[PDB]
Structure formats: C-alpha cells, structure tokens
Amino acid sequence: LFGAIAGFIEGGWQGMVDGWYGYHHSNEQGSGYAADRESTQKAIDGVTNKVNSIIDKMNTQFEAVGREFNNLERRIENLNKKMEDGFLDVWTYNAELLVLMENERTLDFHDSNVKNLYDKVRLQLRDNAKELGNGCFEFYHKCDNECMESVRNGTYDYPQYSEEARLKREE
C-alpha cells in the first residue's frame, strides 16, 4: 500500500467523470475538475493488458471427457473420477487464487499511480505552494486558469512566480 488512495487523500471525487485520476483546481475565476489523461491512459492500458493476460494464460486448461466403466471396473472408475475431480479442483484453486492476488495488485497499482501524480506536481511546485497534506497544494501566489493548465500539462515555470510567493511565505 502506497498510502495515497484512502490514505492522505481521504476520499474520491464524484465530480471527476473523465478519468481515474486527476486534478481539482480553485482560483478567483472559479473551480473545476480535469482528468490527467496520460496517467489515466497508462493505467487503463496496463489493466486491460493484465485482464487479457489472465484470460489468455488460462486458455489451455482441462476438459473432463465422459468415460464409462462396468460393475467389475470400479477401481479404474474411481481412479478416473478422482483424476478429473483433482484436475478441476487444481484449476479452480489456480483461478480463484490468481484473481485474488492480481486484484490486490490492481488496487495497489491504482494507489501507486495516485501517489506518483501527487509527487509529480509536488516536484514542480516546491515552496511556491504549501502541502496541506490532504492531497491539495495551497498556492502562495496567483494561479489563474492558464497557470493551472500549466500545472496540469506539466509546464509550470517555477522562476516566474518565485518572488511573490517568496513574500507571503515570510509574511
């Protein structure tokens, strides 16, 4: 567990319909939601690939053929049924267990993606904003909607806003 989903981000957003992960901004021109298209597409790619992997990997399984034995063949009748039952018990262990394990790994995959997005924004902003520790960054300057879009598409010029942020940290 990477401590982000249901961790320091104490809940999901009913409001973000475009994707799995993303941003919610609020400046003086209002507020809104924007999904992060690249980290959402990477996750849907890896998860449909994992599902196809599980299905393709249990393609060659076991098929129980019907065989019949008479009243003085009960030994190999019993052998046959314990063999077919054994192979199906085995393959249902395999299926149930693989589903459990990769469900756990899928939930933690999503968790990791969320923490990596939070971090990638943290690294851009540094002391230009204040980590509230709830998943939000309270800016130290004036981030209008172009500035927000920069933060989103990764093109946030840290020098440009240094000075005014520099002062309200002091004051």
Binding site: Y21, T92, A95, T106, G135
Partner: protein, 319 residues
C-alpha cells in the same frame, strides 16, 4: 488559491475480493464467470443431436423393436442417452465390450446401415425366430439388425459363410450366441445338442459355446444372448461357422463420418435451440472465459471451474 490531486468515485456497488480484504467495493469490476444456462438441449452449429429417448445404445445398435425411430438416423453432433432407458436388450444378456463400443461411438458422427447378409441367404435354415421377450405391437418379435437362426426340416446343417467388406468404409458388425435353458430346449430349437459359433477375421479368432444351465428369469426369460461386435476393415472378410445357437448379422453399420462427439447422459428434451456450447443440463450463449455450470461440456466453450463468483477488479476502491 488551490489545486488538488484526486481520483474517481461513483455509484458502483461492484465488490471484489483479495487475500487481505473481502467484500471490497470498487469503481470498475469485470465478471469473468458465466453462471447461466438455458436448461435445454440444442443443435451444435446447426447440427441436431441424436437423442435416444428411452432406447439405450445397445437397443439402438442391435435394433430393439421399440427403437424403430432409429432405423435410419441422420448425422449427429452428439448423442444423448437417458439414465435408465427402458428399451435395451429385450432378450436378456450382454453386449460384450459395451463400454469400449460407447467410447468408439463417441468419435463417430454418422452411420449408414447396410444389409450385409439378407434373410434371403439362409435356404437351409429357419430365419423367422421371434421371442416374447421382444414385443412389438402386442406380438412377439426380435432385434431388427440381427437374425435368430433355428432348425429347418428338423436339421441345423452347419453354417459356413463369409462376408467380404467391399465398401470404402469401416463396418461395425454385431452378432451373437444364444444360451438355452436345458437339453430339450436346445434340441427343440436346433437339432444338434452340442454346438458352437466360430468367428474369424484377420484379427479375430472367436469360439463361442452355449452355456446350457439354469438362470434367473429376466424379461420372462431364463435363456440369455451374448452379443459381440467388431470393426471389419475395408477389403477384410468375416467368417462365421456354426451348428446351433448362432444369432447372425443381417444389418451392419458403415462408419461414414468420424469427427468429434460425446455420449451425454441427460434426462432432458430437445429445445429447438442452437448453441456453440452444450452441457448435460443446458446450453451456453456466453463469451465469458469461465463457467460453473457443468464439467462435461462439448463445443467451443469456457473452462469449467467450481467457483460461485469470479470478478476481476479493474478500477479503484470506491468509498
């Protein structure tokens, strides 16, 4: 002046499980377990199954007179036999190596029966034999593919006769021997008191001899009939020689289509449906990769597992 990182949530109630936590709501699941069937027996790619309602495989192949629907069966996809069919060996006895025959029969899709030895072919013997154990329309009768030879002008001259498989295909040939109850019945039906049935092919070298002894009554008969079968290969010949108790072939089965099939034991009836996946308890219209319906599948099918539920998480934990 703020910006936050967050993730999807929605109304979804889809639960998935993990090793650590069960009953975990997620935003996007995916079921991969098909759990529904139509409770009917269907075609298989538009090929109707052979359903021997109330006639067993032995009764069909030997020609029980109650099995007259199956005189000329068309090509099948699979065979459906009931749990305890009523019409099977009216005259009591055995179809020897029956299980191996059913296993052979599960790799055959089409027989064309053919008359290898007509009743016309027994000038010096009586070929009208008939039993109360095999009623047909209230009168005694007998297997339709196989002939009960008896004495004539109070003689059973020894039979020496062969059949050469001229056909392209393998031939399934059934014959039999009759175990009489005592010396006097043995002499009444055939004149000769100690008899035999010799069968020879290129692989087969059989000598059968009547066991004349007292048995329990079954279908009103203490006598018995032991039937045997072989696969006469093309250009090979079969050589019968008897002086009594011989139950001769008349009809044999040309094995003309030999694909993929099974003998499925279901008590169910035809459904007028079609399917790509049949099971004993119903068919399957599904592109799930698994099912829990029945293990004895036939056709293009998901893989049988015993699980009650299999859902893969694709999304996030939701609330």
């Amino acid at each position: 002046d703020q910006i936050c990182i967050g993730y999807h949530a929605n109304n979804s109630t889809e639960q998935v499980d993990t090793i650590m936590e069960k009953n975990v709501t997620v935003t996007h699941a995916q079921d991969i377990l098909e759990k529904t069937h139509n409770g009917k027996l269907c075609d298989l790619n538009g090929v109707k199954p052979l359903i021997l309602k109330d006639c067993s495989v032995a009764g069909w192949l030997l020609g029980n007179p109650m099995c007259d629907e199956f005189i000329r069966v068309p090509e099948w996809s699979y065979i459906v036999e009931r749990a305890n069919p009523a019409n099977d060996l009216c005259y009591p006895g055995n179809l020897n190596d029956y299980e191996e025959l059913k296993h052979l029969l599960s790799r055959i899709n089409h027989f064309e029966k053919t008359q290898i030895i007509p009743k016309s072919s027994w000038p010096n013997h009586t070929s009208s034999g008939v039993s109360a154990a095999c009623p047909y329309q209230g009168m005694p009768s007998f297997f339709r593919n196989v002939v009960w030879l008896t004495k004539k002008n109070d003689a059973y001259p020894t039979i020496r006769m062969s059949y050469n498989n001229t056909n392209r295909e393998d031939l399934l040939i059934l014959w039999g021997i009759h175990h009489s109850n005592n010396a006097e019945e043995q002499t009444n039906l055939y004149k000769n008191p100690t008899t035999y049935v010799s069968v020879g092919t290129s692989t087969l070298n059989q000598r059968l001899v009547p066991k004349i002894a007292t048995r329990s009554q079954v279908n009103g008969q203490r006598g018995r009939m032991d039937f045997f079968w072989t696969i006469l290969r093309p250009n090979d010949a079969i050589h019968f020689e008897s002086n009594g108790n011989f139950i001769a072939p008349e009809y044999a089965y040309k094995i003309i289509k030999t694909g993929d099939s099974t003998i499925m034991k279901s008590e169910m009836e035809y459904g007028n449906c079609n399917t790509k996946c049949q099971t004993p308890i119903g068919a399957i219209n599904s592109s799930m990769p698994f099912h829990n319906i029945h293990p004895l599948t036939i056709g293009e099918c998901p893989k049988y597992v015993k699980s009650n539920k299999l859902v893969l998480a694709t999304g996030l934990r939701n609330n």
